[PDB]
Amino acid sequence: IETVPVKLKPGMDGPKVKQWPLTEEKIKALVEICTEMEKEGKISKIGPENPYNTPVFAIKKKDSTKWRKLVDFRELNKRTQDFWEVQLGIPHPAGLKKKKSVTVLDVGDAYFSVPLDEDFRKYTAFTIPSINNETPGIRYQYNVLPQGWKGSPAIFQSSMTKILEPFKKQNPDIVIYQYMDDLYVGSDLEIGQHRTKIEELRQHLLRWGLMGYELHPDKWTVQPIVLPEKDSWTVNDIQKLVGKLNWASQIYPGIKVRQLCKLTKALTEVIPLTEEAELELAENREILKEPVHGVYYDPSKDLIAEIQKQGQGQWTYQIYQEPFKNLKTGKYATNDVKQLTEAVQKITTESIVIWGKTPKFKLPIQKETWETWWTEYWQATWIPEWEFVNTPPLVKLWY
Amino acid sequence: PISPIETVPVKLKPGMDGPKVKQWPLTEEKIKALVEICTEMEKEGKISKIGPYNTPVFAIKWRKLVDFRELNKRTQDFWEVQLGIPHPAGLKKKKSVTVLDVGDAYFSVPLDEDFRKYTAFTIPSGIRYQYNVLPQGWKGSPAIFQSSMTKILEPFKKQNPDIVIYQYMDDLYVGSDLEIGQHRTKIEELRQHLLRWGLTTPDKKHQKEPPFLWMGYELHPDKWTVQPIVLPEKDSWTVNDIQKLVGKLNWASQIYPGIKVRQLCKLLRGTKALTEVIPLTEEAELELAENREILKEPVHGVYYDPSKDLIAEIQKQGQGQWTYQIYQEPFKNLKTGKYARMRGAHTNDVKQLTEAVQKITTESIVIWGKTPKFKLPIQKETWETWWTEYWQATWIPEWEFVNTPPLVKLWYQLEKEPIVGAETFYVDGAANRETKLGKAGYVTNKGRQKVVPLTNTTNQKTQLQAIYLALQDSGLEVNIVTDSQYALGIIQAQPDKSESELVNQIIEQLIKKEKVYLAWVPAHKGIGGNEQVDKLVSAGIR
Ligand SMILES: CCC(=O)c1ccc(F)c([C@@H]2C[C@@H]2NC(=O)Nc2ccc(Br)cn2)c1O
Numbered sequence A: 001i002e003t004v005p006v007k008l009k010p011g012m013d014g015p016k017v018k019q020w021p022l023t024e025e026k027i028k029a030l031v032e033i034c035t036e037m038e039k040e041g042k043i044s045k046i047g048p049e050n051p052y053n054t055p056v057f058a059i060k061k062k063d064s065t066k067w068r069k070l071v072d073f074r075e076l077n078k079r080t081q082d083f084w085e086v087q088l089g090i091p092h093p094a095g096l097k098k099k100k101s102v103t104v105l106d107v108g109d110a111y112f113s114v115p116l117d118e119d120f121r122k123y124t125a126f127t128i129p130s131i132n133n134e135t136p137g138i139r140y141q142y143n144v145l146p147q148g149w150k151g152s153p154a155i156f157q158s159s160m161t162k163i164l165e166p167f168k169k170q171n172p173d174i175v176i177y178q179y180m181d182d183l184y185v186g187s188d189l190e191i192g193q194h195r196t197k198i199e200e201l202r203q204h205l206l207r208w209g210l211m212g213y214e215l216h217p218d219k220w221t222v223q224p225i226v227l228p229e230k231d232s233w234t235v236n237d238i239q240k241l242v243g244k245l246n247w248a249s250q251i252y253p254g255i256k257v258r259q260l261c262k263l264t265k266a267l268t269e270v271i272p273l274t275e276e277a278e279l280e281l282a283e284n285r286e287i288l289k290e291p292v293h294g295v296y297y298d299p300s301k302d303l304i305a306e307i308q309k310q311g312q313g314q315w316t317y318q319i320y321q322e323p324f325k326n327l328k329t330g331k332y333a334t335n336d337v338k339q340l341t342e343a344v345q346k347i348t349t350e351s352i353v354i355w356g357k358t359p360k361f362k363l364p365i366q367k368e369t370w371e372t373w374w375t376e377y378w379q380a381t382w383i384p385e386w387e388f389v390n391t392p393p394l395v396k397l398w399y
Numbered sequence B: 001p002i003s004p005i006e007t008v009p010v011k012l013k014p015g016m017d018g019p020k021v022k023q024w025p026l027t028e029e030k031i032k033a034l035v036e037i038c039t040e041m042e043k044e045g046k047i048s049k050i051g052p053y054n055t056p057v058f059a060i061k062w063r064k065l066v067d068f069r070e071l072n073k074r075t076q077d078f079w080e081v082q083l084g085i086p087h088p089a090g091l092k093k094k095k096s097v098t099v100l101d102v103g104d105a106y107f108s109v110p111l112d113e114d115f116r117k118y119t120a121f122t123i124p125s126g127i128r129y130q131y132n133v134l135p136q137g138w139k140g141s142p143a144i145f146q147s148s149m150t151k152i153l154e155p156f157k158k159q160n161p162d163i164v165i166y167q168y169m170d171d172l173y174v175g176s177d178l179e180i181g182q183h184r185t186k187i188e189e190l191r192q193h194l195l196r197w198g199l200t201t202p203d204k205k206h207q208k209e210p211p212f213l214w215m216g217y218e219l220h221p222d223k224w225t226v227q228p229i230v231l232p233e234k235d236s237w238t239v240n241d242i243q244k245l246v247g248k249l250n251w252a253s254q255i256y257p258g259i260k261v262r263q264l265c266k267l268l269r270g271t272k273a274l275t276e277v278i279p280l281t282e283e284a285e286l287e288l289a290e291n292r293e294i295l296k297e298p299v300h301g302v303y304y305d306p307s308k309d310l311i312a313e314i315q316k317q318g319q320g321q322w323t324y325q326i327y328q329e330p331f332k333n334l335k336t337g338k339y340a341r342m343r344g345a346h347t348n349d350v351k352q353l354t355e356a357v358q359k360i361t362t363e364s365i366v367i368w369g370k371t372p373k374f375k376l377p378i379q380k381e382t383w384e385t386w387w388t389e390y391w392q393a394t395w396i397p398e399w400e401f402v403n404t405p406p407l408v409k410l411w412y413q414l415e416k417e418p419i420v421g422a423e424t425f426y427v428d429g430a431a432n433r434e435t436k437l438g439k440a441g442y443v444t445n446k447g448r449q450k451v452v453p454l455t456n457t458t459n460q461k462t463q464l465q466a467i468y469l470a471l472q473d474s475g476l477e478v479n480i481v482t483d484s485q486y487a488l489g490i491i492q493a494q495p496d497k498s499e500s501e502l503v504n505q506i507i508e509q510l511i512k513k514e515k516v517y518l519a520w521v522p523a524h525k526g527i528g529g530n531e532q533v534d535k536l537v538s539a540g541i542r
Helices: A024-039 A074-078 A081-087 A108-113 A151-170 A191-206 A235-247 A275-286 A336-354 A367-376 B028-044 B069-074 B141-159 B180-195 B239-252 B262-267 B282-296 B349-368 B380-389 B459-472 B485-492 B501-512 B530-538
Strands: A043-045 A056-060 A067-071 A101-106 A126-128 A138-142 A175-179 A182-187 A304-309 A315-320 A326-332 A360-363 A386-388 B047-049 B057-060 B063-066 B096-101 B121-123 B127-131 B164-168 B171-176 B212-214 B217-219 B224-226 B311-316 B322-329 B332-339 B373-376 B399-401 B423-431 B438-444 B449-454 B477-482 B515-520
Touching: A024 A043, A024 A056, A024 A067, A024 A126, A024 A138, A056 A126, A056 A367, A074 A081, A081 A151, A101 A191, A108 A151, A151 A175, A151 A191, A182 A191, A235 B515, A304 A336, A315 A336, A326 A336, A336 A360, A336 A367, A367 A386, A367 B349, B028 B047, B028 B057, B028 B063, B028 B121, B028 B127, B057 B121, B096 B180, B141 B164, B141 B180, B171 B180, B239 B262, B239 B282, B262 B282, B311 B349, B322 B349, B332 B349, B349 B373, B349 B380, B423 B459, B423 B530, B438 B459, B438 B530, B449 B459, B449 B530, B459 B477, B459 B485, B459 B501, B485 B501, B485 B515
Parallel strands: A304 A360, A360 A386, B311 B373, B373 B399, B423 B477, B477 B515
Antiparallel strands: A043 A138, A056 A067, A101 A182, A126 A138, A175 A182, A304 A315, A315 A326, B047 B127, B057 B063, B096 B171, B121 B127, B164 B171, B212 B217, B217 B224, B311 B322, B322 B332, B423 B438, B438 B449
């Protein structure tokens, strides 16, 4: 078919990101895949006359044995933004988050059938490195739509529509959403019916060639800030209480602490339970239980996720656009990095179902540690933006 | 010759055009040299006479120096020639190894027919020429040359999987596990393969036959080491002298275990004259001494055996300094190294140990493509207690304990619950932003209340100074209540060393105590207790 012309955001040049070193097994994996992708003409060797580069990695399918190739196009996506976001954007259905069940299906292999504009191929160069830099390093570029690029779904959008048309027309209440490599399919059917409907959809996909991992959005609720229920209340326990309440005052308007804040003693000293205090305490937690009034999602602003390590396999997180004005909060529960990588994929996935975009992550870990190990447990086909933070003593707060 | 190999298409940067530099006048001496030289070159096809673009040509002692600064700036970018350099420790043992150096690398490779016009130059009195092969100082020669030399070699490599070839610039290192007899055979089969592609190579002038000197190393077929290190032994030392010494030592630290340069590096601190004499201190004297000791007897490294595991051991030596060895067979070290990076203003040995493990793990992936198993001077218990309570996610590859003092440990733990029957200290600190005058004090539940005045301090410092007070006039067990998240954060990270003089003091107190409990409450919120202290700490001076 006729290729669609692609342009970079004027003023921006192609990606020139260095290739992070890989372990032996991942390198062997990569040359086998690339060798096979070459015979099939999906990618072709290139020389030094190509100044661009994008890093590549090798992940395990869906916890199986087959090594899948993963390319980090975060840079190229950013330099192609208006093309795939505005020029050929894909609307995100508000209904999806409501659906009782959502199945995620990988339709990535479908992109290797459409060719890429010859004038854009150079920007997709990548390098398979070698152990101890003993051999120069194999370089390639794509000839067809690559997988981790957001331009791929935008272009292939035309075909996906014809392929899904029949199934759509026959099942008017099933929601289908596409997001860079995956198809989100939601229904309110009883699981059996749902699972059956997914199978039927795969059969359509089987033609064209181009239970599957299920989510339950409707059963997703916020993680409230908690206040002890106690029954003792030491001087310490109520100082911690007044502190946490002090926080929830710059957020969650209405949180009153005054009739409690006024309760040089020893920390050990226990103290009587106040009248209205009981009332206030109760009224405070009455809030903090329901969304911060006034906070709304701004489609033109970035979403960012912050994660705190609550120790003992417990991780809390918040999603917000402006600090402390939480759109959503939650929890997650043996390598710290393995759990963290797990939490990041869960949060991104929920984030895609709900807003249709990935959040930028503030990760409580050392850069070098994350970069050395995240691919080791990663299993999604997308890669979110991330920065490394030093968690303030805001872990006690829980949000 | 000129390789019959396809040429690499090359173009100029986006909105730029070929160079048009003016040819500055030369003397008769130079003009004659250039003519003799260019004629010689013209006969071999390296250059061709042309009848719009110009690049200045010089001549110096007689060689032709083309100044390509203009063209290079207008020439496109290429992908880097190498991501890194192989490390000896990562090399496999080899029976026979020979080095062949390509005759006229650049001049034996054609230049994209459509780019030659930009390489035009002239010889004054004018005679004009352009290049057909890769020019010397041009920006694309190293890339296109290596790239071309790689295509030329593929066919031969395929037919000789048993033959290993490493291209480094002009030279070619060919190694195999064959017999010097059958090896040299194969070498010739290679020279001939290269000759069929326009590349001439030595006949028996093969600089080949180790010991080989390369990149600062000396590789033998059975081992490798760094080239001879020799410490001067001067009566005086200039900044320049110390810098050279620190460089050699750091270079030797790749295989000579235990090299230390902290004392020597301390001297080079503070902007100072390159030729100025710096008197050595006792510590630097001892350090330089220890190093000389280590360097007296030659040490060699072993090559990598893909079939065995890597074992990395890390020893602690001095504060903030770590040394490590990586071997496969007990004590036959593949490589050596040292870690010392501070990283932050306050840290403890466990954090530092975790960082070193990180360096080694990354370094290992690059060199051997796999992470080694560690032997750390830390108890599974000390590690577990720290991993669990630290806020930062920490991981560490498969390791084992190894009792090689100094063992690593936490020097104090902070209670998670308030101590009972312990005196509670409500501390606070204020400071006037203009006069910098402050007051660090406290008030306890036993009625004690001290308030010292401070001069030239920040607001954070009075808060840190106030905690230092509560720790002095305090018993072995104490509950402290601060309103400083800053102080809390630092202390709650259990640091055992800092760049802050005050923080290091607070650490001494913390180690002496037997039970300490820190707590935080909001500032200026009149919180019962904090107000009392806040009252006298902010009374004036704020
Ligand atoms: C002397 C430098 C050198 O020979 C050399 C340097 C880097 C490099 F990657 C290689 C190729 C990998 C192959 N060599 C080896 O694996 N081992 C090896 C052992 C002893 C000697 Br001498 C040279 N090489 C090299 O052969």
